[PDB]
Protein: Outer capsid protein VP4
Amino acid sequence: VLDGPYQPVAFKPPNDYWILVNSNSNGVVLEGTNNTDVWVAIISIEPNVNSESRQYSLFGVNKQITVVNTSNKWKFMEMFRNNSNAEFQHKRTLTSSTKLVGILKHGGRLWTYHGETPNATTDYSTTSNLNEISVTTYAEFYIIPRSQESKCTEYINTGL
Structure:
């Protein structure tokens, strides 16, 4: 049912496969880019963090990012930009008790999860250059075909 776990690598995911990362620590879980119009990084924040500034290496650059998470769940912050000259924006949030995060390339679009477990759902960013998006994971991950997406969304929301 679940292909993995693979060790952390940089690679170019094929289309229509969910990459499901089993995050452990509170740093950058995941980052991806095609070097033309998508840079995305997913940042993990542990439970019960009052508002403060933390530093993260995004694509080899130390960046200052304001974080907060007053819940008892982990927070995964989806940072995004579409221009190599811009700064990252906190685009989306996944609030999770499972610590599992997803990214998929499908239909000209880049898909992640957001919301609150157990009712987290997918959303998208657009691109003209989907197939050049490569992904560097910083924790162990599994591969799921999009045809099995409902299982992926179960994992995301209820764990392994």
